[PDB]
């Protein structure tokens, strides 16, 4: 009875503190910045071979190797320049929802509704790809996994918790609690010190890996958050939700900066990604196409409309010379 | 091109051949989703994710039992959904109706038919014959309900259980008829804990669904 009033007073204090710093907006300082203009992109490669909807995709560090996952139960490694396949990895379960590529190029990870994260070894003397370890301990389904090094991995699940794992021993070292809904997407900072998690409670939190404590909590969305991206400089968020709205958050002003929306968009958002310079913001939609946004102006620069179904995957290479998309029509496309 | 690129092309061709070979076997199995609340008797209708397999008339089936707002999206390619309701608990029928409404009007299931099982008929008959609990205590509209003249009760059944069964079936069906515009159909069924013919009903309903899809594909409907 007494703690609710204290919590409300603290929330009001935080709200008053945030309002005091709103001395300017992006829409006002950017009046002296020229628009990016019209951007045209065309299909350069088409990747065929999948027989089911594609759910996950991730780029390598060499800008040539690509890994994709689909509901047919197989994991395929692609060579983007020649379209040749390198590996084909059978899965123990066909309900896969995420995939990842190790920064050293030696390991690949995947998971899904089986509540287990599996790590594969791509470089063996026998020539075959083999399973190295299965990570168990979650109670809900696994939605995303990201590598920190060859021995640490961060996972997010639908049981409102996040975890940091030790691959050598298979034990959970840190548990992140505080969410009230299923956790959808993760984004790892370039400095490998902080990560961001979105959830179905229409909120986003910033976590400290080294201590396991939540630092800041952001609100504003009206529905579930499906994708989160990280600005290259480490000080901004990019989030999407099912209410057809994209938002930009700052970690130093502790409030929202810009809203990306349009009256003709009434569908959900599935993926968000950035360019190298951060000027372009890419987003996937359920309208069977992908839009190109101006991060500093909230305008529309172009559109990619080569898919016949929902777009579920989106990524940009480390050198910035290609953009890859995935859809439920079992096709992958490389744009330039 | 170099010889190594030709060898890589040969490896890619073999990988493509192996991918193509595997796809043929996958398409010969029909997939079903099983949903229901506790005490409904889901595990006995055909007796992270639990799986079961059965075969009727040389046709293989694969049924999945998960454990709903998020993981339902990946089951939009299944042939049919199986829903089991306990018809011998008046206190919890409104929850079943709300769940059926929430599943029927889901935007990702707009093209998937539902097979509805109304289970535990013997307990309902015993409770109706005993007269220690009345439907009118929870459903006021039942006092004005009359058995339709086109009813086909099983021989020997007292004309007091047919009224209750048809009332429950009507209450479940009326939700299905309010929306859909013909894109999917509901198939009500009455079953019990001891019935074994349940396997044939799924086969017949799936054959009917595939027939409907084939009729629609040929510009006949």
């Amino acid at each position: 009875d007494q703690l609710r009033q204290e919590a409300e007073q603290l929330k009001n204090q935080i709200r008053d503190a945030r309002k005091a710093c709103a001395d300017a907006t992006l829409s006002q300082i950017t009046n002296n910045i020229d628009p990016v203009g019209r951007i045209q992109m065309r299909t350069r490669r088409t990747l065929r071979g999948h027989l089911a909807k594609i759910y996950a995709m991730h780029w390598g560090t060499d800008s040539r190797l690509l890994v994709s996952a689909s509901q047919d139960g197989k994991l395929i490694i692609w060579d983007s320049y020649t379209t040749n396949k390198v590996h084909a990895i059978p899965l123990r379960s066909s309900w896969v929802m995420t995939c990842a590529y190790a920064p050293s190029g030696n390991y690949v990870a995947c998971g899904g509704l089986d509540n287990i994260c599996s790590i594969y070894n791509l470089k063996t003397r026998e020539g075959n790809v083999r399973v190295s370890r299965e990570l168990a301990g979650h109670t809900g389904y696994l939605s995303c996994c990201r590598f920190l090094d060859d021995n640490q991995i961060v996972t997010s699940s639908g049981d409102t918790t996040c975890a940091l794992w030790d691959i050598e021993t298979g034990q959970q070292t840190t548990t992140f609690t505080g969410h009230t809904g299923d956790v959808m997407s993760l984004s790892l900072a370039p400095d490998t010190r902080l990560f961001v998690s979105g959830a179905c409670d229409a909120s986003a939190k910033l976590w400290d890996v080294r201590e396991g404590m939540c630092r800041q909590t952001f609100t504003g969305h009206e529905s579930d958050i499906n994708a989160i991206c990280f600005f290259p400089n480490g000080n901004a968020f990019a989030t999407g939700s099912d209410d057809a709205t994209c938002r930009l958050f700052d970690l130093r002003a502790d409030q929202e900066l810009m809203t990306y929306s349009h009256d003709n968009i009434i569908c959900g958002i599935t993926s968000v990604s950035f360019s190298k310079s951060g000027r372009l913001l890419l987003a996937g939609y359920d309208d069977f196409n992908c839009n190109v946004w101006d991060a500093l102006k909230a305008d529309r620069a172009g559109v990619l409309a080569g898919h016949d179904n929902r777009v579920s995957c989106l990524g940009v290479t480390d050198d910035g010379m290609a953009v890859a998309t995935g859809s439920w029509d079992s096709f992958l496309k490389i744009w330039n | 091109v170099s010889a190594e690129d030709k060898a890589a092309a040969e490896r890619s061709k073999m990988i493509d051949k192996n991918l193509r070979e595997d796809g043929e076997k996958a398409r010969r199995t029909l997939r079903l989703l099983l949903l229901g609340a506790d005490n409904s008797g889901k595990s006995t209708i055909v007796k992270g994710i639990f799986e079961t397999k059965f075969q009727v008339d040389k046709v293989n089936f694969h049924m999945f039992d998960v454990g709903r707002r998020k993981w339902i999206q990946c089951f939009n390619d299944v042939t049919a959904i199986i829903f089991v309701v306990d018809s011998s608990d008046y206190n919890r029928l409104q929850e079943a109706l709300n769940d059926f409404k929430s599943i029927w009007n889901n935007r990702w299931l707009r093209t998937i038919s539902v097979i509805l099982f109304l289970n535990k008929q013997d307990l309902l008959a015993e409770k109706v014959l005993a007269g220690k609990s009345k439907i009118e205590d929870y459903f006021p509209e039942f006092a004005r309900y009359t058995t339709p003249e086109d009813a086909t009760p099983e021989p020997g059944e007292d004309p007091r259980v047919t009224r209750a069964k048809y009332f429950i079936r009507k209450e479940f069906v009326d939700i299905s008829t309010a929306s859909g515009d013909g894109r999917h159909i509901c198939y009500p069924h009455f079953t019990c804990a001891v019935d074994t013919e349940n396997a044939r009903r799924i086969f017949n309903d799936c054959k009917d669904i595939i027939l409907q899809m084939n009729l629609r594909e040929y510009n006949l409907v």
């Epitope: 390198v86 | 190594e4 890589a8």
Partner: single-chain antibody
Framework: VQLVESGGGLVQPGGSRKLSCSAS????????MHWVRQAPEKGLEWVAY????????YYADTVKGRFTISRDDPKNTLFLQMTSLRSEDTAMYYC??????????????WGQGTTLTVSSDIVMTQATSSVPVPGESVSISCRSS???????????LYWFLQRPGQSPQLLIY???NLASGVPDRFSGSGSGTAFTLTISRLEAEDVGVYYC?????????FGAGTKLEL
């Protein structure tokens, strides 16, 4: 990972004999296979190659019409059929494992070998018979008749080391890639038709003959060999 060869013996001119190789410890069906022949005073010579899927087969210009190579995946065995043997065929035969994809190492493992006793090409040139020489730096050079640099950015030069009584071991592939299991004392560089091999610090195990090989076009060619005497 183990390869064992069998067969061999003494034959008369005009006869025939069949060789076999038993593979174990790896996925034999995913690898391509080569046969390499070495004479007492001639060096290494390429004989034949068979793809993993039995798709393509190549033969040397001195063995066409007389040698036949076959594969048996279910038994993990190789066969080489030889007919109308001549006096020039008396030499050691080795079996080599190969796999080709982006980033692979196509000449990583060599067998032990068996002995058989009877009774346009790119020229790879080395010229030194013996380099007298622990702790010192040694440089070995190779020269090719035609440029080994392809338009795709890859240059196909390979280095091998043969210790006394041991099979050849891979050191460097594609001129800058250090093979697994090799200490970091070895390095290599070059451009066009000139290449060099560098050893930072010699030990007692760095004694042997070093060979150069190109992989641009068939047939494959080897160098004369440079012997390092400590």
């Amino acid at each position: 990972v183990q390869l064992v060869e069998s067969g061999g013996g003494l034959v008369q001119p005009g006869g025939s004999r069949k060789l076999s190789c038993s593979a174990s410890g790896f996925a034999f069906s995913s690898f391509g296979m080569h046969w390499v022949r070495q004479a007492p005073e001639k060096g290494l010579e390429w004989v034949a190659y068979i793809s993993s899927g039995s798709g393509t087969i190549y033969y040397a210009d001195t063995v066409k019409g007389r040698f036949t190579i076959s594969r048996d995946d279910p038994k993990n065995t190789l066969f080489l059929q030889m007919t109308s043997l001549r006096s020039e065929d008396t030499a050691m035969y080795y079996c080599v494992r190969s796999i080709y994809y982006y980033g692979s190492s196509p000449f990583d493992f060599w067998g032990q070998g068996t002995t058989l006793t009877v009774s346009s090409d790119i020229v790879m040139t080395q010229a030194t018979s013996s380099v007298p020489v622990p702790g010192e730096s040694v440089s070995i050079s190779c020269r090719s008749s035609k440029s080994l640099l392809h338009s795709n950015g890859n240059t196909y030069l390979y280095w091998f080391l043969q210790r006394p009584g041991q099979s050849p071991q891979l050191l460097i592939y594609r001129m800058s890639n250090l093979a697994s299991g090799v200490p970091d004392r070895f390095s290599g560089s070059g451009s066009g038709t000139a290449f060099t091999l560098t050893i930072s610090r010699l030990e007692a195990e760095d004694v042997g003959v070093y060979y150069c090989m190109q992989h641009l076009e068939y047939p494959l060619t080897f160098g004369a060999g440079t012997k390092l005497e400590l």
